[PDB]
Amino acid sequence: EKDLLALDSWKNLWSWFSITNWLWYIK
């Protein structure tokens, strides 16, 4: 259901990484 290969489940994890938000302070 949530394997590492199935990137369809990574999207929920990609949302967890709000780096693009931290890069806005220096971008």
Side-chain angles (χ1 to χ4, degrees):
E1 216 191 320
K2 286 147 178 199
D3 289 67
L4 298 173
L5 272 126
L7 273 133
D8 298 312
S9 281
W10 270 85
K11 293 193 295 174
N12 267 116
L13 152 287
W14 286 135
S15 205
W16 208 79
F17 278 124
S18 44
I19 285 306
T20 185
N21 206 40
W22 109 265
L23 266 174
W24 243 80
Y25 178 77
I26 43 144
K27 175 141 65 138

PDB file of all heavy atoms in Angstrom:
ATOM      1  N   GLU A   1       0.854  -1.223   0.000  1.00  0.00           N
ATOM      2  CA  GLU A   1       0.000   0.000   0.000  1.00  0.00           C
ATOM      3  C   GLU A   1       0.876   1.255   0.000  1.00  0.00           C
ATOM      4  O   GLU A   1       0.599   2.216  -0.691  1.00  0.00           O
ATOM      5  CB  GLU A   1      -0.815  -0.086   1.291  1.00  0.00           C
ATOM      6  CG  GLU A   1      -2.221   0.464   1.046  1.00  0.00           C
ATOM      7  CD  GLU A   1      -2.940   0.645   2.383  1.00  0.00           C
ATOM      8  OE1 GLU A   1      -2.780  -0.209   3.239  1.00  0.00           O
ATOM      9  OE2 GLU A   1      -3.640   1.635   2.528  1.00  0.00           O
ATOM     10  N   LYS A   2       1.930   1.254   0.771  1.00  0.00           N
ATOM     11  CA  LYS A   2       2.825   2.447   0.818  1.00  0.00           C
ATOM     12  C   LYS A   2       4.289   2.014   0.691  1.00  0.00           C
ATOM     13  O   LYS A   2       5.067   2.143   1.615  1.00  0.00           O
ATOM     14  CB  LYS A   2       2.568   3.081   2.185  1.00  0.00           C
ATOM     15  CG  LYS A   2       1.207   3.781   2.176  1.00  0.00           C
ATOM     16  CD  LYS A   2       0.577   3.689   3.568  1.00  0.00           C
ATOM     17  CE  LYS A   2      -0.762   4.431   3.572  1.00  0.00           C
ATOM     18  NZ  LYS A   2      -1.048   4.699   5.009  1.00  0.00           N
ATOM     19  N   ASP A   3       4.668   1.501  -0.450  1.00  0.00           N
ATOM     20  CA  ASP A   3       6.080   1.060  -0.640  1.00  0.00           C
ATOM     21  C   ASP A   3       6.953   2.244  -1.063  1.00  0.00           C
ATOM     22  O   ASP A   3       6.460   3.322  -1.340  1.00  0.00           O
ATOM     23  CB  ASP A   3       6.023   0.011  -1.752  1.00  0.00           C
ATOM     24  CG  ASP A   3       5.349  -1.257  -1.224  1.00  0.00           C
ATOM     25  OD1 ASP A   3       4.167  -1.199  -0.933  1.00  0.00           O
ATOM     26  OD2 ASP A   3       6.029  -2.265  -1.122  1.00  0.00           O
ATOM     27  N   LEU A   4       8.244   2.053  -1.118  1.00  0.00           N
ATOM     28  CA  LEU A   4       9.150   3.168  -1.524  1.00  0.00           C
ATOM     29  C   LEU A   4       9.114   3.352  -3.039  1.00  0.00           C
ATOM     30  O   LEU A   4       9.363   4.425  -3.554  1.00  0.00           O
ATOM     31  CB  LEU A   4      10.542   2.734  -1.069  1.00  0.00           C
ATOM     32  CG  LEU A   4      10.559   2.581   0.453  1.00  0.00           C
ATOM     33  CD1 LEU A   4      11.895   1.978   0.891  1.00  0.00           C
ATOM     34  CD2 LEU A   4      10.382   3.955   1.104  1.00  0.00           C
ATOM     35  N   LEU A   5       8.807   2.310  -3.750  1.00  0.00           N
ATOM     36  CA  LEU A   5       8.749   2.398  -5.236  1.00  0.00           C
ATOM     37  C   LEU A   5       7.534   3.199  -5.668  1.00  0.00           C
ATOM     38  O   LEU A   5       7.608   4.103  -6.477  1.00  0.00           O
ATOM     39  CB  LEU A   5       8.633   0.955  -5.703  1.00  0.00           C
ATOM     40  CG  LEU A   5      10.036   0.378  -5.856  1.00  0.00           C
ATOM     41  CD1 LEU A   5      10.145  -0.916  -5.055  1.00  0.00           C
ATOM     42  CD2 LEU A   5      10.304   0.097  -7.332  1.00  0.00           C
ATOM     43  N   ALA A   6       6.423   2.854  -5.121  1.00  0.00           N
ATOM     44  CA  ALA A   6       5.154   3.555  -5.453  1.00  0.00           C
ATOM     45  C   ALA A   6       5.271   5.031  -5.095  1.00  0.00           C
ATOM     46  O   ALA A   6       4.974   5.442  -3.991  1.00  0.00           O
ATOM     47  CB  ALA A   6       4.097   2.880  -4.582  1.00  0.00           C
ATOM     48  N   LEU A   7       5.711   5.824  -6.023  1.00  0.00           N
ATOM     49  CA  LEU A   7       5.864   7.277  -5.752  1.00  0.00           C
ATOM     50  C   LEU A   7       4.507   7.963  -5.610  1.00  0.00           C
ATOM     51  O   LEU A   7       4.422   9.092  -5.167  1.00  0.00           O
ATOM     52  CB  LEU A   7       6.676   7.817  -6.922  1.00  0.00           C
ATOM     53  CG  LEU A   7       8.157   7.634  -6.578  1.00  0.00           C
ATOM     54  CD1 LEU A   7       8.902   7.031  -7.762  1.00  0.00           C
ATOM     55  CD2 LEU A   7       8.771   8.986  -6.215  1.00  0.00           C
ATOM     56  N   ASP A   8       3.438   7.285  -5.930  1.00  0.00           N
ATOM     57  CA  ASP A   8       2.097   7.909  -5.746  1.00  0.00           C
ATOM     58  C   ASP A   8       1.904   8.206  -4.254  1.00  0.00           C
ATOM     59  O   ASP A   8       1.142   9.070  -3.867  1.00  0.00           O
ATOM     60  CB  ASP A   8       1.091   6.860  -6.227  1.00  0.00           C
ATOM     61  CG  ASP A   8       1.336   6.560  -7.708  1.00  0.00           C
ATOM     62  OD1 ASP A   8       1.451   7.502  -8.473  1.00  0.00           O
ATOM     63  OD2 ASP A   8       1.405   5.390  -8.050  1.00  0.00           O
ATOM     64  N   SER A   9       2.616   7.491  -3.417  1.00  0.00           N
ATOM     65  CA  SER A   9       2.524   7.708  -1.944  1.00  0.00           C
ATOM     66  C   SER A   9       3.602   8.700  -1.489  1.00  0.00           C
ATOM     67  O   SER A   9       3.536   9.252  -0.408  1.00  0.00           O
ATOM     68  CB  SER A   9       2.766   6.331  -1.325  1.00  0.00           C
ATOM     69  OG  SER A   9       1.575   5.559  -1.418  1.00  0.00           O
ATOM     70  N   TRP A  10       4.581   8.945  -2.320  1.00  0.00           N
ATOM     71  CA  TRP A  10       5.657   9.917  -1.964  1.00  0.00           C
ATOM     72  C   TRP A  10       5.091  11.335  -1.975  1.00  0.00           C
ATOM     73  O   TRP A  10       5.519  12.188  -1.222  1.00  0.00           O
ATOM     74  CB  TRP A  10       6.697   9.786  -3.066  1.00  0.00           C
ATOM     75  CG  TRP A  10       7.697   8.750  -2.723  1.00  0.00           C
ATOM     76  CD1 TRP A  10       7.581   7.431  -2.952  1.00  0.00           C
ATOM     77  CD2 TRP A  10       8.970   8.952  -2.103  1.00  0.00           C
ATOM     78  NE1 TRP A  10       8.742   6.806  -2.536  1.00  0.00           N
ATOM     79  CE2 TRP A  10       9.631   7.713  -1.985  1.00  0.00           C
ATOM     80  CE3 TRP A  10       9.596  10.100  -1.643  1.00  0.00           C
ATOM     81  CZ2 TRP A  10      10.902   7.623  -1.417  1.00  0.00           C
ATOM     82  CZ3 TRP A  10      10.874  10.029  -1.066  1.00  0.00           C
ATOM     83  CH2 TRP A  10      11.529   8.788  -0.953  1.00  0.00           C
ATOM     84  N   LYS A  11       4.131  11.594  -2.827  1.00  0.00           N
ATOM     85  CA  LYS A  11       3.525  12.957  -2.899  1.00  0.00           C
ATOM     86  C   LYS A  11       3.145  13.450  -1.504  1.00  0.00           C
ATOM     87  O   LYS A  11       3.372  14.592  -1.153  1.00  0.00           O
ATOM     88  CB  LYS A  11       2.266  12.773  -3.750  1.00  0.00           C
ATOM     89  CG  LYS A  11       2.664  12.421  -5.184  1.00  0.00           C
ATOM     90  CD  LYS A  11       1.449  12.563  -6.102  1.00  0.00           C
ATOM     91  CE  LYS A  11       0.392  11.525  -5.716  1.00  0.00           C
ATOM     92  NZ  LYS A  11      -0.792  11.850  -6.559  1.00  0.00           N
ATOM     93  N   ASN A  12       2.593  12.584  -0.696  1.00  0.00           N
ATOM     94  CA  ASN A  12       2.230  12.989   0.688  1.00  0.00           C
ATOM     95  C   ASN A  12       3.510  13.325   1.450  1.00  0.00           C
ATOM     96  O   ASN A  12       3.523  14.167   2.328  1.00  0.00           O
ATOM     97  CB  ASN A  12       1.527  11.776   1.302  1.00  0.00           C
ATOM     98  CG  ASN A  12       0.018  11.898   1.086  1.00  0.00           C
ATOM     99  OD1 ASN A  12      -0.577  11.093   0.398  1.00  0.00           O
ATOM    100  ND2 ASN A  12      -0.632  12.880   1.649  1.00  0.00           N
ATOM    101  N   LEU A  13       4.592  12.678   1.106  1.00  0.00           N
ATOM    102  CA  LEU A  13       5.884  12.959   1.788  1.00  0.00           C
ATOM    103  C   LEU A  13       6.519  14.202   1.160  1.00  0.00           C
ATOM    104  O   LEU A  13       7.137  15.001   1.835  1.00  0.00           O
ATOM    105  CB  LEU A  13       6.712  11.679   1.551  1.00  0.00           C
ATOM    106  CG  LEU A  13       8.225  11.957   1.537  1.00  0.00           C
ATOM    107  CD1 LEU A  13       8.607  12.669   0.242  1.00  0.00           C
ATOM    108  CD2 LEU A  13       8.619  12.825   2.731  1.00  0.00           C
ATOM    109  N   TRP A  14       6.360  14.376  -0.127  1.00  0.00           N
ATOM    110  CA  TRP A  14       6.950  15.578  -0.785  1.00  0.00           C
ATOM    111  C   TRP A  14       6.298  16.830  -0.206  1.00  0.00           C
ATOM    112  O   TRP A  14       6.918  17.869  -0.093  1.00  0.00           O
ATOM    113  CB  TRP A  14       6.659  15.421  -2.278  1.00  0.00           C
ATOM    114  CG  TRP A  14       7.551  14.367  -2.849  1.00  0.00           C
ATOM    115  CD1 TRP A  14       7.159  13.388  -3.694  1.00  0.00           C
ATOM    116  CD2 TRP A  14       8.974  14.170  -2.626  1.00  0.00           C
ATOM    117  NE1 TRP A  14       8.255  12.599  -4.003  1.00  0.00           N
ATOM    118  CE2 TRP A  14       9.397  13.042  -3.366  1.00  0.00           C
ATOM    119  CE3 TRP A  14       9.926  14.855  -1.859  1.00  0.00           C
ATOM    120  CZ2 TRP A  14      10.724  12.610  -3.343  1.00  0.00           C
ATOM    121  CZ3 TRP A  14      11.262  14.425  -1.830  1.00  0.00           C
ATOM    122  CH2 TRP A  14      11.660  13.304  -2.571  1.00  0.00           C
ATOM    123  N   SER A  15       5.056  16.732   0.189  1.00  0.00           N
ATOM    124  CA  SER A  15       4.368  17.906   0.791  1.00  0.00           C
ATOM    125  C   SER A  15       4.986  18.187   2.158  1.00  0.00           C
ATOM    126  O   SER A  15       4.988  19.300   2.643  1.00  0.00           O
ATOM    127  CB  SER A  15       2.913  17.466   0.951  1.00  0.00           C
ATOM    128  OG  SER A  15       2.074  18.613   0.954  1.00  0.00           O
ATOM    129  N   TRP A  16       5.496  17.159   2.787  1.00  0.00           N
ATOM    130  CA  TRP A  16       6.106  17.305   4.135  1.00  0.00           C
ATOM    131  C   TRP A  16       7.382  18.143   4.051  1.00  0.00           C
ATOM    132  O   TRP A  16       7.736  18.865   4.962  1.00  0.00           O
ATOM    133  CB  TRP A  16       6.439  15.868   4.545  1.00  0.00           C
ATOM    134  CG  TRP A  16       6.414  15.742   6.031  1.00  0.00           C
ATOM    135  CD1 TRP A  16       5.298  15.632   6.782  1.00  0.00           C
ATOM    136  CD2 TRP A  16       7.538  15.698   6.952  1.00  0.00           C
ATOM    137  NE1 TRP A  16       5.664  15.535   8.112  1.00  0.00           N
ATOM    138  CE2 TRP A  16       7.037  15.571   8.268  1.00  0.00           C
ATOM    139  CE3 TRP A  16       8.931  15.761   6.773  1.00  0.00           C
ATOM    140  CZ2 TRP A  16       7.890  15.507   9.371  1.00  0.00           C
ATOM    141  CZ3 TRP A  16       9.793  15.698   7.880  1.00  0.00           C
ATOM    142  CH2 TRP A  16       9.273  15.572   9.177  1.00  0.00           C
ATOM    143  N   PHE A  17       8.067  18.044   2.943  1.00  0.00           N
ATOM    144  CA  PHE A  17       9.322  18.819   2.745  1.00  0.00           C
ATOM    145  C   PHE A  17       8.990  20.204   2.200  1.00  0.00           C
ATOM    146  O   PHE A  17       8.962  20.429   1.006  1.00  0.00           O
ATOM    147  CB  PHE A  17      10.106  18.023   1.715  1.00  0.00           C
ATOM    148  CG  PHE A  17      10.833  16.889   2.395  1.00  0.00           C
ATOM    149  CD1 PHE A  17      10.635  15.572   1.964  1.00  0.00           C
ATOM    150  CD2 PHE A  17      11.706  17.153   3.458  1.00  0.00           C
ATOM    151  CE1 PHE A  17      11.310  14.519   2.594  1.00  0.00           C
ATOM    152  CE2 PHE A  17      12.380  16.101   4.089  1.00  0.00           C
ATOM    153  CZ  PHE A  17      12.182  14.784   3.657  1.00  0.00           C
ATOM    154  N   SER A  18       8.735  21.123   3.073  1.00  0.00           N
ATOM    155  CA  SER A  18       8.394  22.509   2.637  1.00  0.00           C
ATOM    156  C   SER A  18       9.666  23.345   2.459  1.00  0.00           C
ATOM    157  O   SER A  18       9.703  24.513   2.794  1.00  0.00           O
ATOM    158  CB  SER A  18       7.535  23.077   3.766  1.00  0.00           C
ATOM    159  OG  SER A  18       8.120  22.736   5.017  1.00  0.00           O
ATOM    160  N   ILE A  19      10.705  22.759   1.926  1.00  0.00           N
ATOM    161  CA  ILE A  19      11.970  23.510   1.716  1.00  0.00           C
ATOM    162  C   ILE A  19      11.730  24.695   0.799  1.00  0.00           C
ATOM    163  O   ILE A  19      12.169  25.796   1.066  1.00  0.00           O
ATOM    164  CB  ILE A  19      12.883  22.482   1.059  1.00  0.00           C
ATOM    165  CG1 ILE A  19      13.352  21.507   2.128  1.00  0.00           C
ATOM    166  CG2 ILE A  19      14.083  23.166   0.398  1.00  0.00           C
ATOM    167  CD1 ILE A  19      13.987  22.295   3.266  1.00  0.00           C
ATOM    168  N   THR A  20      11.047  24.483  -0.287  1.00  0.00           N
ATOM    169  CA  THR A  20      10.788  25.606  -1.224  1.00  0.00           C
ATOM    170  C   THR A  20      10.256  26.816  -0.443  1.00  0.00           C
ATOM    171  O   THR A  20      10.329  27.946  -0.882  1.00  0.00           O
ATOM    172  CB  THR A  20       9.721  25.072  -2.179  1.00  0.00           C
ATOM    173  OG1 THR A  20       9.469  26.030  -3.196  1.00  0.00           O
ATOM    174  CG2 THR A  20       8.430  24.787  -1.408  1.00  0.00           C
ATOM    175  N   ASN A  21       9.750  26.562   0.739  1.00  0.00           N
ATOM    176  CA  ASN A  21       9.238  27.664   1.601  1.00  0.00           C
ATOM    177  C   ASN A  21      10.417  28.333   2.307  1.00  0.00           C
ATOM    178  O   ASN A  21      10.469  29.536   2.466  1.00  0.00           O
ATOM    179  CB  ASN A  21       8.324  26.978   2.617  1.00  0.00           C
ATOM    180  CG  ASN A  21       7.269  27.971   3.108  1.00  0.00           C
ATOM    181  OD1 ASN A  21       6.740  28.745   2.334  1.00  0.00           O
ATOM    182  ND2 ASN A  21       6.938  27.983   4.370  1.00  0.00           N
ATOM    183  N   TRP A  22      11.370  27.539   2.719  1.00  0.00           N
ATOM    184  CA  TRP A  22      12.562  28.083   3.403  1.00  0.00           C
ATOM    185  C   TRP A  22      13.492  28.737   2.380  1.00  0.00           C
ATOM    186  O   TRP A  22      14.228  29.654   2.688  1.00  0.00           O
ATOM    187  CB  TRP A  22      13.204  26.867   4.072  1.00  0.00           C
ATOM    188  CG  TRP A  22      14.460  26.509   3.374  1.00  0.00           C
ATOM    189  CD1 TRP A  22      14.592  25.593   2.415  1.00  0.00           C
ATOM    190  CD2 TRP A  22      15.746  27.082   3.577  1.00  0.00           C
ATOM    191  NE1 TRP A  22      15.924  25.547   2.023  1.00  0.00           N
ATOM    192  CE2 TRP A  22      16.678  26.469   2.726  1.00  0.00           C
ATOM    193  CE3 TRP A  22      16.158  28.069   4.434  1.00  0.00           C
ATOM    194  CZ2 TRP A  22      18.022  26.846   2.734  1.00  0.00           C
ATOM    195  CZ3 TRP A  22      17.504  28.473   4.464  1.00  0.00           C
ATOM    196  CH2 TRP A  22      18.439  27.858   3.612  1.00  0.00           C
ATOM    197  N   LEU A  23      13.450  28.274   1.162  1.00  0.00           N
ATOM    198  CA  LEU A  23      14.315  28.868   0.107  1.00  0.00           C
ATOM    199  C   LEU A  23      13.774  30.234  -0.316  1.00  0.00           C
ATOM    200  O   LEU A  23      14.475  31.037  -0.897  1.00  0.00           O
ATOM    201  CB  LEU A  23      14.260  27.892  -1.052  1.00  0.00           C
ATOM    202  CG  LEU A  23      15.438  26.940  -0.928  1.00  0.00           C
ATOM    203  CD1 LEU A  23      15.319  25.873  -1.991  1.00  0.00           C
ATOM    204  CD2 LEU A  23      16.752  27.707  -1.121  1.00  0.00           C
ATOM    205  N   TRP A  24      12.528  30.503  -0.029  1.00  0.00           N
ATOM    206  CA  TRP A  24      11.937  31.818  -0.413  1.00  0.00           C
ATOM    207  C   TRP A  24      12.621  32.953   0.355  1.00  0.00           C
ATOM    208  O   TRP A  24      12.636  34.090  -0.075  1.00  0.00           O
ATOM    209  CB  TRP A  24      10.459  31.721  -0.020  1.00  0.00           C
ATOM    210  CG  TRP A  24       9.605  31.833  -1.243  1.00  0.00           C
ATOM    211  CD1 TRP A  24       9.362  30.828  -2.115  1.00  0.00           C
ATOM    212  CD2 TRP A  24       8.880  32.994  -1.744  1.00  0.00           C
ATOM    213  NE1 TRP A  24       8.535  31.298  -3.119  1.00  0.00           N
ATOM    214  CE2 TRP A  24       8.210  32.627  -2.934  1.00  0.00           C
ATOM    215  CE3 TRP A  24       8.740  34.317  -1.284  1.00  0.00           C
ATOM    216  CZ2 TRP A  24       7.428  33.540  -3.645  1.00  0.00           C
ATOM    217  CZ3 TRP A  24       7.954  35.238  -1.997  1.00  0.00           C
ATOM    218  CH2 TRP A  24       7.300  34.850  -3.175  1.00  0.00           C
ATOM    219  N   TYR A  25      13.195  32.646   1.490  1.00  0.00           N
ATOM    220  CA  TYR A  25      13.893  33.694   2.293  1.00  0.00           C
ATOM    221  C   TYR A  25      15.243  34.023   1.647  1.00  0.00           C
ATOM    222  O   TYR A  25      15.793  35.086   1.861  1.00  0.00           O
ATOM    223  CB  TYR A  25      14.086  33.062   3.675  1.00  0.00           C
ATOM    224  CG  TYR A  25      14.835  34.017   4.573  1.00  0.00           C
ATOM    225  CD1 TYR A  25      14.172  35.110   5.143  1.00  0.00           C
ATOM    226  CD2 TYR A  25      16.195  33.811   4.835  1.00  0.00           C
ATOM    227  CE1 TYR A  25      14.867  35.996   5.976  1.00  0.00           C
ATOM    228  CE2 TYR A  25      16.890  34.697   5.666  1.00  0.00           C
ATOM    229  CZ  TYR A  25      16.227  35.789   6.237  1.00  0.00           C
ATOM    230  OH  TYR A  25      16.913  36.662   7.056  1.00  0.00           O
ATOM    231  N   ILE A  26      15.787  33.128   0.872  1.00  0.00           N
ATOM    232  CA  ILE A  26      17.101  33.404   0.237  1.00  0.00           C
ATOM    233  C   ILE A  26      17.002  33.386  -1.289  1.00  0.00           C
ATOM    234  O   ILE A  26      17.910  33.797  -1.984  1.00  0.00           O
ATOM    235  CB  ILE A  26      18.017  32.301   0.724  1.00  0.00           C
ATOM    236  CG1 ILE A  26      17.291  30.963   0.690  1.00  0.00           C
ATOM    237  CG2 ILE A  26      18.477  32.599   2.151  1.00  0.00           C
ATOM    238  CD1 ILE A  26      18.283  29.885   0.291  1.00  0.00           C
ATOM    239  N   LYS A  27      15.912  32.908  -1.809  1.00  0.00           N
ATOM    240  CA  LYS A  27      15.745  32.852  -3.286  1.00  0.00           C
ATOM    241  C   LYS A  27      15.386  34.240  -3.829  1.00  0.00           C
ATOM    242  O   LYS A  27      15.919  34.605  -4.864  1.00  0.00           O
ATOM    243  CB  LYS A  27      14.595  31.867  -3.507  1.00  0.00           C
ATOM    244  CG  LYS A  27      14.239  31.813  -4.991  1.00  0.00           C
ATOM    245  CD  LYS A  27      13.906  30.373  -5.390  1.00  0.00           C
ATOM    246  CE  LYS A  27      12.639  29.920  -4.661  1.00  0.00           C
ATOM    247  NZ  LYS A  27      11.856  29.167  -5.681  1.00  0.00           N
TER     248      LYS A  27
END
